[PDB]
Structures are given as structure tokens and as C-alpha cells.
Amino acid sequence: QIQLVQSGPELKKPGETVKISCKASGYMFTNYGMNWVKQAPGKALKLMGWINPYTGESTFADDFKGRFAFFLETSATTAYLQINNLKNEDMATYFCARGTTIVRAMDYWGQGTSLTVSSAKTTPPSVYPLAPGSAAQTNSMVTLGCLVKGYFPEPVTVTWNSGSLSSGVHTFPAVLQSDLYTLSSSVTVPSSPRPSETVTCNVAHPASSTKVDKKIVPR
Amino acid sequence: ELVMTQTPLSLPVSLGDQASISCRSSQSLVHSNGNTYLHWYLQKPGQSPKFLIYKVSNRFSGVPDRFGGSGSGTDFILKISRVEAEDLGVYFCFQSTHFFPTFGGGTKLEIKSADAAPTVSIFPPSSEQLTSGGASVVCFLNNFYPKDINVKWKIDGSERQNGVLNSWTDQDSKDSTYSMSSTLTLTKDEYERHNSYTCEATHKTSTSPIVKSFNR
Numbered sequence: 498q499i500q501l502v503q504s505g506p507e508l509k510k511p512g513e514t515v516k517i518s519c520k521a522s523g524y525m526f527t528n529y530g531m532n533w534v535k536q537a538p539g540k541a542l543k544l545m546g547w548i549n550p551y552t553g554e555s556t557f558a559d560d561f562k563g564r565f566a567f568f569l570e571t572s573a574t575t576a577y578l579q580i581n582n583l584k585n586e587d588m589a590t591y592f593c594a595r596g597t598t599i600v601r602a603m604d605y606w607g608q609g610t611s612l613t614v615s616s617a618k619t620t621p622p623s624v625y626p627l628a629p630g631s632a633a634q635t636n637s638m639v640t641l642g643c644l645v646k647g648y649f650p651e652p653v654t655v656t657w658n659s660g661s662l663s664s665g666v667h668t669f670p671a672v673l674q675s676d677l678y679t680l681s682s683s684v685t686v687p688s689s690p691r692p693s694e695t696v697t698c699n700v701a702h703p704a705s706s707t708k709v710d711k712k713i714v715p716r
Numbered sequence: 717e718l719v720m721t722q723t724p725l726s727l728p729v730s731l732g733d734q735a736s737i738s739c740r741s742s743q744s745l746v747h748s749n750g751n752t753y754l755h756w757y758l759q760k761p762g763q764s765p766k767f768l769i770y771k772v773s774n775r776f777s778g779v780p781d782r783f784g785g786s787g788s789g790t791d792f793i794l795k796i797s798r799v800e801a802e803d804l805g806v807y808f809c810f811q812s813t814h815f816f817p818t819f820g821g822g823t824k825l826e827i828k829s830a831d832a833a834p835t836v837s838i839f840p841p842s843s844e845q846l847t848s849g850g851a852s853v854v855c856f857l858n859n860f861y862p863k864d865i866n867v868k869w870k871i872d873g874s875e876r877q878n879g880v881l882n883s884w885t886d887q888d889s890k891d892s893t894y895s896m897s898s899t900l901t902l903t904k905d906e907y908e909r910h911n912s913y914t915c916e917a918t919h920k921t922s923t924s925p926i927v928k929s930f931n932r
């Protein structure tokens with residue numbers, strides 16, 4: 498019954514302000530405090546603070562002063578986390594979580610809200626074929642790849658042979674290089690079916706409505 | 717502030733086996749009121765953290781019998797008698813005895829399997845990237861185990877620790893191995909200034925690094 502449904506992903510530029518909602522249900526919204534937690538990519542959970550119930554007081558960790566606010570629209574049992582004057586270090590995922598006073602802990606957590614802060618403008622990726630460079634060679638299998646470079650924002654969807662190829666593939670998380678993202682994906686197939694049987698990566702970027710195919714030819 | 721230190725960072729286990737992880741506070745968590753506010757949470761890849769144990773040894777509703785929390789003062793332990801696949805993920809301890817509640821850094825419960833050397837492949841800058849004025853050399857070190865691996869890049873026989881971006885996949889669903897991608901990005905001028913480009917992988921499966929190179 499208890500549900501904490503958070504608002505969708507956010508894309509903002511430094512200096513802007515963001516409002517992340519947390520819609521609660523299945524419980525008496527006015528009897529529990531709402532906590533907010535920040536988690537930077539692959540890092541530990543960090544408690545930002547919370548907003549007491551019947552009283553309406555908010556506590557903030559030292560790291561979250563001046564630009565942060567907690568408030569709620571009880572008539573709709575929703576809690577908000579407002580971040581003004583966005584900084585790059587504000588980029589992370591945010592969690593809303595119910596607090597249970599007697600135990601001094603958060604019990605039910607929201608699904609999480611990802612926040613990206615960047616001055617970069619939408620940009621479709623550049624897709625390059627990664628075929629072997631005339632060295633090494635024989636054995637039972639061959640690895641091929643595709644470099645998806647210079648796109649924004651995330652994400653990108655990579656498939657091989659329209660998704661028919663699945664077991665031999667490894668698509669890696671994107672990394673930021675100067676306001677822009679780059680990811681790579683490898684596929685390993687038996688050396689007998691290639692180039693005999695075509696192998697092509699398909700890169701799609703919704704953000705910019707982009708769909709690109711790149712057949713891997715002996716480069 | 718209360719520092720919560722968890723160990724290990726990664727705990728490889730075989731499903732069905734027992735698992736035990738530690739959480740230590742820089743200050744005793746025993747409150748003046750007698751309670752010890754040390755809790756545990758399970759965060760699954762992509763999912764919201766889940767409430768597991770409260771006040772040291774009390775199981776939150778719905779939490780399986782196999783989860784047991786113990787310890788006192790500054791030292792705590794969370795034990796899983798028989799690990800199931802649903803238990804894999806990152807465990808976090810959290811204290812709220814001392815103003816400004818703090819979390820431990822986490823312990824990732826992963827799968828143990830036999831050692832596996834990485835499969836390393838190097839790819840020179842594509843022709844269309846070059847034409848466009850760019851030059852990235854990519855190296856794949858795939859399906860290896862354990863997860864600890866270091867990759868070095870040498871340009872004309874000398875190490876380059878710059879222009880390098882690395883990315884790592886999560887443990888593989890069907891074979892429990894790990895994979896890494898490392899790409900050396902350099903200016904086209906630079907690329908056209910050197911001949912040899914090598915990708916060196918160091919893994920416990922070998923006394924000698926695995927080297928993949930090409931000379932343009």
C-alpha cells in the first residue's frame with residue numbers, strides 16, 4: 498500500500514533551479530517525516546536532511562545550506578526537494594524516504610530521481626566502427642566494436658544486428674569528456690561468420706531523435 | 717561527525733553460502749536513552765534502497781529469516797546464513813544515534829567463480845574518426861575474474877597516463893565475469909606523431925601483463 502512515487506529525470510543547466518516531487522500514499526502523510534538522500538554515481542548514500550510532520554521543521558546537513566529547501570503539499574500528500582542556483586556537484590540521483598520516529602530510520606523509499614546539471618547542448622553521437630587493425634588474428638573468435646562519441650544528454654541505446662546479437666555483447670557505461678558523453682560496445686562472434694555474416698551496430702539517441710547503423714567491415 | 721566504516725568493499729560469495737559484513741562507528745552508537753540506532757539497508761542495482769534491519773538486530777517486516785544483525789557499541793555485523801540471488805547488491809549501515817545521521821560507504825555482495833584471464837583487444841582510430849579530425853584508441857579487456865584489474869597505455873614504448881577514460885560493466889548475469897573498456901584519446905596531430913600504441917593489462921591471472929599493440 499505504502500507508495501512513494503518520485504518525479505521523472507531532470508536535465509538542467511548551472512544556475513537553474515529544480516523541483517523534485519515525492520508523491521506518497523498508502524499511509525497517513527501527516528504522521529511521518531520525509532527524508533531526502535543524495536547519491537552520486539557509484540558513491541554512498543548521503544542524508545540531506547528531513548522535514549518533521551506535525552511541526553513542519555526541516556533539518557539540513559551542513560553540506561546543504563542556503564540553496565536547498567524542503568516543503569510539502571499535504572493536500573496531495575506530496576513532498577518536494579527544491580534546489581536553487583544549481584551547481585555541477587548537484588548532479589546525482591535523489592531519493593525521497595519516509596522516516597519512522599520511534600526507530601529513527603527511513604523505512605519506505607522512493608524510486609529515485611536522477612538530476613543532471615550541464616551547460617552542454619543536445620548533440621547526437623558520432624558512431625565509429627571498431628574492426629581489427631591488421632595484427633594478431635586467428636583463433637576461434639573475433640571481437641568487434643563501435644565507439645559512440647560526443648553525445649548529450651544521456652542515454653544512448655546500442656544494439657547489434659537490431660538486437661539479434663545479444664550474448665556476445667558488452668555495452669559499457671558512458672564517460673564524460675568535456676561536457677560530452679562517450680561509450681563503447683564490443684561484440685564477439687566466431688571468426689568464421691565474419692565478415693561472412695554481417696555484423697552491424699545500431700545507435701539510437703532519443704534526446705536528439707537519432708538512429709544510426711554502422712556495419713563493421715574489415716578496417 | 718560519526719564516521720561509519722564498512723568492510724569489505726566487495727564480498728564475493730557463492731549462492732547458498734553464508735555471508736558476513738562488518739560496520740564500525742568512530743563513536744559508540746549506544747544512545748543516552750539506552751537504544752542503539754544502527755540500521756542496515758539493501759540497495760539493488762537500479763532499485764530503491766530497502767529497509768533490512770533496525771536498531772542492530774531487529775528485522776524489518778517482510779525481511780527473510782536468513783538476515784541477522786548483531787554487535788554493540790562501535791562494532792556491528794550483518795550475517796546472511798544462506799545467500800540467495802535476491803540478496804545480491806549493496807549493503808549500507810546507517811546510524812542515527814548522533815546528530816547528523818551518517819551512512820557507511822557500502823559493501824557489494826557479488827558472485828564468486830573461478831579465476832579467468834581477460835580477453836584483450838586493441839582497435840586503432842577508425843578511418844572516419846581520423847577524417848573527422850579525431851583519434852581514439854580503444855581497448856577491451858573482457859570477461860575476467862576477479863574484478864581487480866589495471867590497464868596501462870604506452871605510446872612509442874613509454875607510458876601515457878593521460879587522455880585515458882575507463883568504464884567497467886557490472887558482474888555478468890550469466891557468467892559472473894567482469895569487463896572493462898579503456899580508450900586513449902589523443903589529438904590527430906599527436907597520433908600522427910607516433911607509431912606504436914600498446915594496451916597493457918595486469919591481472920592476478922598472470923605474472924606478466926597481457927599486451928596488445930599495433931604500430932600504425
Ligand SMILES: CN1C(=O)[C@@H]2[C@H](C1=O)[C@]1(Cl)C(Cl)=C(Cl)[C@@]2(Cl)C1(Cl)Cl
Nearest residue numbers: 530547549596597598601602603812
Ligand atoms: C522526523 N524525522 C527526524 O527527525 C529524522 C528523520 C525523520 O523522519 C529520521 Cl529517518 C527519523 Cl525517523 C528520525 Cl527520529 C530522524 Cl533523526 C532520522 Cl533517523 Cl534522520
